[PDB]
From Swiss-Prot, chain A:
PTM annotation: Sumoylated by UBE2I in response to MEKK1-mediated stimuli.
Portion of the parent chain present: 63 to 147 of 439
Disease linkage: Deafness, cataract, impaired intellectual development, and polyneuropathy: An autosomal recessive disease characterized by early onset of deafness, cataract, severe developmental delay, and severely impaired intellectual development. Patients later develop polyneuropathy of the lower extremities, associated with depigmentation of the hair in that area.
Record's signal peptide: none
Highest taxon, organism lineage: Eukaryota
Function statement: Component of the 26S proteasome, a multiprotein complex involved in the ATP-dependent degradation of ubiquitinated proteins. This complex plays a key role in the maintenance of protein homeostasis by removing misfolded or damaged proteins, which could impair cellular functions, and by removing proteins whose functions are no longer required. Therefore, the proteasome participates in numerous cellular processes, including cell cycle progression, apoptosis, or DNA damage repair.
Gene name for this UniProt entry: PSMC3
Protein name according to UniProt: 26S proteasome regulatory subunit 6A
Places the protein is found: Cytoplasm; Nucleus
Disulfide bonds: none
Protein family (similarity comment): Belongs to the AAA ATPase family.
UniProtKB/Swiss-Prot annotation, chain B:
GO CC list: cytosol; extracellular exosome; extracellular region; ficolin-1-rich granule lumen; membrane; nucleoplasm; nucleus; proteasome complex
Protein name: 26S proteasome non-ATPase regulatory subunit 7
One Pfam family hit: MitMem_reg
InterPro entries with a match to the protein in the record: EIF3F/CSN6-like_C (IPR024969), JAMM/MPN+_dom (IPR000555), MPN (IPR037518), MPN_RPN7_8 (IPR033858)
Molecular function per GO: protein homodimerization activity
Keyword terms: Acetylation, Isopeptide bond, Proteasome, Ubl conjugation
Assembly and binders: Component of the 19S proteasome regulatory particle complex. The 26S proteasome consists of a 20S core particle (CP) and two 19S regulatory subunits (RP). The regulatory particle is made of a lid composed of 9 subunits including PSMD7, a base containing 6 ATPases and few additional components. Within the complex, PSMD7 interacts with subunit PSMD4 through their respective MPN domain. Interacts with TRIM5.
Classification via CDD domains: MPN_RPN7_8
Additional remarks: Does not bind a metal ion.
Stretches assigned to the MPN domain: 5-140
Swiss-Prot record, chain D:
Annotated gene: PSMC5
Function: Component of the 26S proteasome, a multiprotein complex involved in the ATP-dependent degradation of ubiquitinated proteins. This complex plays a key role in the maintenance of protein homeostasis by removing misfolded or damaged proteins, which could impair cellular functions, and by removing proteins whose functions are no longer required. Therefore, the proteasome participates in numerous cellular processes, including cell cycle progression, apoptosis, or DNA damage repair.
Outcome when changing R2Q: In a colorectal cancer sample; somatic mutation
Protein name: 26S proteasome regulatory subunit 8
Span of the entire protein shown here: 59 to 108 of 406
Organism of origin: Homo sapiens (Human)
Family: Belongs to the AAA ATPase family.
Assembly notes: Component of the 19S proteasome regulatory particle complex. The 26S proteasome consists of a 20S core particle (CP) and two 19S regulatory subunits (RP). The regulatory particle is made of a lid composed of 9 subunits, a base containing 6 ATPases including PSMC5 and few additional components. Component of a complex with USP49 and RUVBL1. Interacts with PRPF19. Interacts with TRIM5. Interacts with NDC80. Interacts with PAAF1. Interacts, in vitro, with the thyroid hormone receptor (in a thyroid hormone T3-dependent manner) and with retinoid X receptor (RXR). Interacts with ERCC6.
Subcellular location, record wording: Cytoplasm; Nucleus
Curated annotation (Swiss-Prot), chain G:
Compartments it resides in: Cytoplasm; Nucleus
GO biological process, one term: proteolysis
Family the entry assigns: Belongs to the AAA ATPase family.
Nucleotide-binding keyword on record: yes
Source taxonomy: Eukaryota, Metazoa, Chordata, Craniata, Vertebrata
Single GO cellular component term: cytosol
Keyword line: Acetylation, ATP-binding, Cytoplasm, Nucleotide-binding, Nucleus, Phosphoprotein, Proteasome
Residues annotated to bind ATP: G136, P137, P138, G139, C140, G141, K142, T143
Taxonomic source organism: Homo sapiens (Human)
Subunit structure: Component of the 19S proteasome regulatory particle complex. The 26S proteasome consists of a 20S core particle (CP) and two 19S regulatory subunits (RP). The regulatory particle is made of a lid composed of 9 subunits, a base containing 6 ATPases including PSMC4 and few additional components. Interacts with NR1I3. Interacts with PAAF1. Interacts with TRIM5. Interacts with ZFAND1.
Superkingdom as given in the UniProt entry: Eukaryota
GO molecular-function term, one example from the UniProt record: proteasome-activating activity
Protein name per UniProt: 26S proteasome regulatory subunit 6B
Function as written in the Swiss-Prot or TrEMBL entry: Component of the 26S proteasome, a multiprotein complex involved in the ATP-dependent degradation of ubiquitinated proteins. This complex plays a key role in the maintenance of protein homeostasis by removing misfolded or damaged proteins, which could impair cellular functions, and by removing proteins whose functions are no longer required. Therefore, the proteasome participates in numerous cellular processes, including cell cycle progression, apoptosis, or DNA damage repair.
Complete-protein stretch covered: 71 to 349 of 418
Gene designation: PSMC4
Length: 74, 286, 278, 50, 219, 94, 279
């Protein structure tokens, strides 16, 4: 029952590894939320949202990570 | 599950360079390490790995130990640099397998659902594409034995990758590539009879040995079954080609015709143009 | 004081993680560490190379974790050979693999740790099979500008490495740096099987496996006939006549020698009837 | 061609447009999508053809 | 408890760089494909072994690798503004027929707009085609917008609202493909309805030839 | 049992071994086509039943001795003339 | 070793590559090629084929870093968008004018004979023009006789709006209209239809309209490309516009467009005909 405090230390220690990834939120990216599954060709399932960049280039990245899809519309 | 494996020369060397590690200090057994597999599909691939200190006693033939402090934290190392790379099993240089090898795989099944072992060879000798691969399953047996755990052979094939042929394929430098279309196919033919009919004689002598001794293997039945699939044509005396006789030369029909037609005009290109350019320079100079 | 040109002995096992760990960081640049032994001033050996975590935010001197090496050296003790660290390396796939602005900042830090700390770069792109590519360099001290600035004795191992001179910006870094010679101490035991494992796997898998009949020759005859008239109009084009057209022009190749080998493919493949059978 | 390609390997090689010529031997270069450039000598062909 | 470490392992997947989208054109051979990124450069590159036959396509948007520029997986599209056009709502039915006038005009777009979805067979059997457009002007009274607006969401939850502010765009306005994009996602809704309001601004007349702003209006 | 081929078989031979009448040979050999022991189509002009592939079953001590006779015979015949391919054609390769 | 050196040059550069536009052949062993981004690149040509596939203007593949000249298109992969789509049928039957035979005789000589005929031209010596200019709407006319020609004869129809090639960069523009007109001379018979080019005919020097003036020089570029069809093979250029007042004088000048087809005002004649077709 006390194992909750044991894992609470490693998630805060790994949240510090997120801190160096949170400095800094270097650029703006227009978000578009998408849900699709790709049959292969074993099975790979996941939610992936197409992302933009204001540089006029467009990229493709999995759903964030950190803040989930609960927020927001694209 | 695991059908075939892809072994890179880079990860196979990781077993070979460790043969210099513990080869100088000795003493017994062989080189053994844990295998890092890359699984994108049913076909298995291996990129890197890590060699672990390992020993197997003789007396005491059933004694084996991996170092699992080496296995745990070093996994978090390769995992941090490469997220896709994970342990699919273990390996060793053999050359053959003692009965104790049953316990090495069952212990590490906590790491991977099925751990594939790769028997490698540090000194290339015979008979062909080297090393080996096994998969751990349970077929029990027909005779009624208690559940039998026996490693089934997995076909191993070498494969390449981008950027890895830089230093690897450079150091040889002595190979002639290839040449496809002339020598490449014919050297195989001389070997296809050699390597084809030598295993023919090695097995047919062991199959005769069956009646004598070493029975079981009965086998059964796989031996004669696919041998009879080889029997679609025997081919025995004489060749039973009465239907394939006129068809024999009929396949050589156009191959000889074109070879007769091409060499005629290729000559007209070679002979004429050579005579033209030759006398233009030769006689107009003097 | 006395400085002699260094010779780098690389092991075939150390060559693996140079291109392999570099391939994992492609396209982005990685940061590694070289592992070896210092024999003397004029020669040096790298007996091992290991992978270090790639930086997705860009390479920095703090990308190397000191507890990563301290846990690694302890695992090297239980491993066959626990050899001391020597120097560092980094991949540069996106360009011609030259020392960047971060590479010089991590130089004075690593050359303070270890004496030499040879700077080694590698790129996948320049070739695939038959070129060494890679790169190497060693910092010559800028404080030495008061003293003689032209090492080393035993020159042309540098001088020949100074060929091709590899464009401008690369040798533009020859200010404050000098490259180092890379030769291969013989692994040929492993290198002999490196050729055997490669070619046997490439020879029909058993040499047996691999060993559109008239139609492939009906498709070939279009290359063996319909190509002839476009080839044999050129000698009538060589006839001017005569002579107002610019000469010489040689149309003899390459179709003639291709159709030659085209029969060499078809004749010995048809010999499979006489070879395989009986 | 391999050695010459290494000279053309890094950025390739471009094509400029000279708007004016100077006696100092520096020639102004202009690329259509890019901005105007200029460079020191640079002397290959006879200058009268420039 | 362990779900946090699962999100930590998801951050390891976040370390992967995003690839670059592109539009294919055609194919020279099976080993040579011509792709064109949204930025406008074209690349003839090779392809990897994990793709399928559905990648080829007649010029369908694909994503290109960051090194070999090979196509991994094709994303259909992406649109930021679409959701703001999804939220338009109007009542009636009754509230449309409650406007009090004109009586026959309520009887107009009723069977013109709403009817094709519920009973498409009535038009195709007799052979009469429904109108593909309409124009409502004013203001002799009110009801220019409301007459078409209430029947707009009365067809179904389907509607797409267009404001004249999105056509002008900016200097060298790229909304030419956004007018195509907005109508592309208008076809995502079936059966589609298209609005245009206050066209006396973006409807610029070529009678007296003015600045090129009148030309891009025609474009 | 036989090395064959000797692949196509005459109905009278089936009418001897299997001792079946001529009108019933159809149902006989064609049912084996569905069972999977032989895929060979039947030639109904001369009423001769042609065979394809084969179904192996078990083995006997005389089958191994019968094997070494007609199996290694393929090994000794091919390798003998394979040396002729190696002998004469090694000069044009070098 | 020299045969091994043949594998060397064929190994370079392997993959990847980038498309580029060839400009002209300046001298041996090297030539200049415009990049897809628009910047012209001067590149050493590959030592294999220096001549036949070079061509004055073509799209040639280049390496990423080195931009090396290796191989051009067949030609061609053509370009984006699409063609045809007018073959769905039915549209309009030509039998309406079949009673006159005075009108069809001039049409019969101006349609199917200019499509494919050879020995009849050089004999009489008259060079048939490619020019077709359609003005006069209202009424509509036009596309009726377009899909009606599809009933008459079968050919590839290039259908693009005058604004279809307007993009964010000015480097892709000259290539698209070049790829449109280069398939017209490549494939026969070919018909290209552009609707209302009077838009880009607007003349404005301003830099923000510089691209807008860049596409009118593109219109003058493809204008330079339409004399490349001369002579005689091959193209059919049909032009339609609602207002020709904004068009330039040199666009309607003969020698390029030699035939102005004025669609008459509906007046009284088109009244009864147009009530019958709708009913
Ligand atoms: N017959 C009606 N019944 C109820 N409400 C009405 C009626 N006519 C107008 N309204 C109210 O007036 C507002 C504007 O309606 P509407 O769009 O018809 O006029 P408008 O188009 O804004 O005026 P204009 O035509 O001058 O632009 C709406 O919000 C609506 O609630
Ligand atoms: N018999 C006919 N007579 C005249 N016009 C017709 C006839 N049949 C169909 N049409 C019209 O022709 C139109 C197609 O013409 P097109 O696509 O060339 O545009 P357009 O009419 O030239 O446009 P605009 O009139 O604005 O220039 C259709 O919308 C159709 O309504
Ligand atoms: Zn760096």
């Amino acid at each position: 029952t006390h194992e909750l405090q044991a894992m609470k230390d490693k998630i805060k220690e790994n949240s510090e590894k997120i801190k160096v990834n949170k400095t800094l939120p270097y650029l703006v990216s227009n978000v578009i939320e998408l849900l699709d599954v790709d049959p292969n060709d074993s099975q790979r399932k996941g939610k992936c949202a197409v992302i933009k960049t204001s540089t006029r280039q467009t990229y493709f990245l999995p759903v964030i990570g950190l803040v989930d899809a609960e927020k927001l519309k694209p | 599950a695991v059908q075939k494996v892809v072994v890179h020369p880079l990860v196979l060397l990781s077993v070979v360079d460790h043969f210099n590690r513990i080869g100088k200090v000795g003493n017994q057994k062989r080189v053994v390490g844990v295998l890092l597999g890359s699984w994108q599909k049913k076909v298995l691939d291996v990129s890197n790995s890590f060699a672990v200190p390992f020993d197997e006693d003789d007396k005491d033939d059933s004694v084996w130990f991996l170092d699992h402090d080496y296995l745990e934290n070093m996994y978090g190392m390769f995992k941090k640099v490469n997220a896709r790379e994970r342990i699919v099993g273990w390996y060793h240089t053999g050359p053959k397998l003692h009965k104790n090898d049953i316990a090495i795989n069952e212990l590490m099944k906590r790491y991977c659902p099925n751990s594939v072992l790769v028997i490698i060879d540090v000194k290339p000798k015979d008979l062909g594409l080297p090393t080996e691969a096994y998969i751990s399953v349970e077929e029990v047996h027909d005779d009624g034995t208690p559940t039998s755990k026996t490693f089934e052979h997995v076909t191993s094939e070498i494969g390449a990758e981008e950027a890895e042929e830089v230093g690897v394929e450079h150091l040889l430098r002595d190979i002639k590539d290839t040449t496809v279309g002339t020598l490449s196919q014919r050297i195989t033919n001389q070997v296809h009879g050699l390597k084809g009919l030598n295993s023919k004689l090695l097995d047919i002598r062991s199959y005769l040995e069956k009646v004598a001794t070493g029975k079981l293997p009965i086998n059964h039945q796989i031996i004669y079954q696919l041998q009879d699939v080889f029997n679609l044509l025997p081919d025995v005396s004489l060749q039973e080609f009465v239907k394939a006789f006129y068809l024999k030369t009929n396949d050589q029909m156009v191959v000889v015709y074109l070879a007769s037609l091409i060499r005629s005009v290729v000559a007209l290109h070679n002979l004429i143009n050579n005579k033209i350019a030759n006398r233009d320079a030769e006689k107009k100079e003097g | 004081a006395v400085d002699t040109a260094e010779q780098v002995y690389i092991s075939s096992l150390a060559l693996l993680k140079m291109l392999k760990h570099g391939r994992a960081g492609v396209p982005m640049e990685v940061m590694g560490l070289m592992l070896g032994e210092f024999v003397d001033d004029y020669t040096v050996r790298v007996i091992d190379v290991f992978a270090m975590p790639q930086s997705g935010t860009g390479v920095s001197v703090e990308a190397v974790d000191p507890v990563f090496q301290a846990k690694m050296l302890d695992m090297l003790k239980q491993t066959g050979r626990p050899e001391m660290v020597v120097g560092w390396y980094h991949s540069h796939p996106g360009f011609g693999c030259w020392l960047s602005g971060v590479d010089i900042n991590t130089q004075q830090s690593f050359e303070a740790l270890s004496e030499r700390a040879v700077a080694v770069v590698v790129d996948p792109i320049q070739s695939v099979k038959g070129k060494v590519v890679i790169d190497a360099f060693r910092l010559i001290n800028a404080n030495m500008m008061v003293l003689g600035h032209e090492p080393r004795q035993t020159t042309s191992n540098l001088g020949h490495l100074n060929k091709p001179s590899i464009q401008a910006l690369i040798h533009g870094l020859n200010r404050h740096y000098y490259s180092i010679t890379i030769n291969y101490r013989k692994n040929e035991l492993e290198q002999k099987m490196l050729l055997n494992l490669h070619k046997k796997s490439w020879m029909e898998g058993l040499t047996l496996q691999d060993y559109v009949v008239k139609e492939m020759l009906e498709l070939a005859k279009n290359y063996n006939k319909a190509v002839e008239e476009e080839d044999k109009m050129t000698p009538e084009q060589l006839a001017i006549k005569n002579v107002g057209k610019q000469d010489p022009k040689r149309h003899l190749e390459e179709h003639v020698d291709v159709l030659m080998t085209s029969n060499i493919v078809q004749c010995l493949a048809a010999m499979l009837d006489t070879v395989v059978f009986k | 061609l391999r050695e010459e390609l290494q000279l053309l390997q890094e950025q390739g090689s471009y094509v400029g447009e000279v708007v004016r010529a100077m006696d100092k031997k520096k020639v102004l270069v202009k690329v259509h999508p890019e901005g105007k450039f200029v460079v020191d000598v640079d002397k290959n062909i006879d200058i009268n053809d420039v | 408890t362990k779900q946090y470490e699962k999100s930590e392992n998801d951050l390891k997947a976040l370390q992967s760089v995003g690839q670059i989208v592109g539009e294919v054109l055609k194919q020279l051979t099976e080993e040579k494909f011509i792709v064109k990124a949204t930025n406008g450069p074209r690349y003839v590159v090779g392809c990897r072994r994990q793709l399928d036959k559905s990648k080829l396509k007649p010029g369908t948007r694909v994503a290109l690798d960051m090194t070999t520029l090979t196509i991994m997986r094709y994303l259909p599209r992406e649109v930021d503004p679409l959701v703001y056009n999804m939220s338009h709502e109007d009542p009636g039915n009754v509230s449309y027929s409650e406007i009090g006038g004109l009586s026959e005009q309520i009887r107009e777009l009723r069977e013109v707009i709403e009817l094709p979805l519920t009973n498409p067979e009535l038009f195709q059997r007799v052979g009469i085609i429904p109108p593909k457009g309409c124009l409502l002007y004013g203001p002799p009274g009110t009801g220019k917008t409301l007459l078409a607006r209430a029947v707009a969401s009365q067809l179904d939850c389907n509607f797409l609202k267009v404001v004249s502010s999105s056509i002008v765009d900016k200097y060298i306005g790229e909304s030419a493909r956004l007018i195509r994009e907005m109508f592309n996602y208008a076809r995502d809704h079936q059966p589609c309805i298209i609005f245009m309001d206050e066209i006396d601004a973006i409807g610029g007349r070529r009678f007296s030839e003015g600045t090129s702003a009148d030309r891009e209006i025609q474009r | 049992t036989r090395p064959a081929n000797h692949r196509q078989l005459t109905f009278e031979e089936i009418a001897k071994s299997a001792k079946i009448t001529v009108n019933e040979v159809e149902l006989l050999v064609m049912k084996a086509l569905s069972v999977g022991l032989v895929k060979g189509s039947i030639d109904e002009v001369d009423k001769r039943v042609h065979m394809t592939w084969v179904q192996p079953r078990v083995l006997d001590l005389q089958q191994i001795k019968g094997m070494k006779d007609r199996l290694e015979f393929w090994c000794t015949d091919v390798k003998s003339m394979e040396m002729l391919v190696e002998h004469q054609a090694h000069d044009i390769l070098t | 070793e020299f045969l091994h050196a043949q594998e060397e040059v064929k190994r370079i550069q392997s993959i990847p590559l980038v498309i580029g536009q060839f400009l002209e052949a300046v001298d041996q062993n090297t030539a200049i090629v415009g990049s897809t981004t628009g910047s012209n690149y001067y590149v050493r040509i590959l030592s294999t084929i220096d001549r036949e596939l070079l061509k004055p203007n073509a799209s040639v593949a280049l390496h990423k870093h080195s931009n090396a000249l290796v191989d051009v298109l067949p030609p061609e992969a053509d370009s984006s968008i699409m063609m045809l789509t007018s073959d769905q049928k039915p549209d309009v039957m030509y039998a309406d004018i079949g009673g006159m035979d005075i009108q069809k005789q001039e049409v019969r000589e101006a349609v199917e004979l200019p499509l494919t005929h050879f020995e009849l031209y050089k004999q009489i010596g008259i060079d048939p023009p490619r020019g077709v200019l359609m003005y006069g709407p209202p009424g509509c006319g036009k596309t009726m006789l377009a899909k009606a020609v599809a009933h008459h004869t079968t050919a590839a129809f290039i259908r693009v709006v005058g604004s279809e090639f307007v993009q964010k960069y000015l480097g892709e523009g000259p290539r698209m209209v070049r790829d449109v007109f280069r398939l017209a001379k490549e494939n026969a018979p070919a018909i290209i239809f552009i609707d209302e080019i009077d838009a880009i005919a607007t003349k404005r020097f301003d830099a923000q309209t510089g691209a807008d003036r860049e596409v009118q020089r593109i219109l003058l570029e493809l204008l330079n490309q339409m004399d490349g069809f001369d002579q005689n093979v091959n193209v059919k250029v049909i032009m339609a516009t609602n207002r020709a007042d904004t068009l330039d004088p040199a666009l309607l000048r003969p020698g390029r467009l030699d035939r102005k087809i004025e669609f008459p005002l509906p007046d009284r004649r088109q009244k009864r005909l147009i009530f019958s077709t709708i009913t």
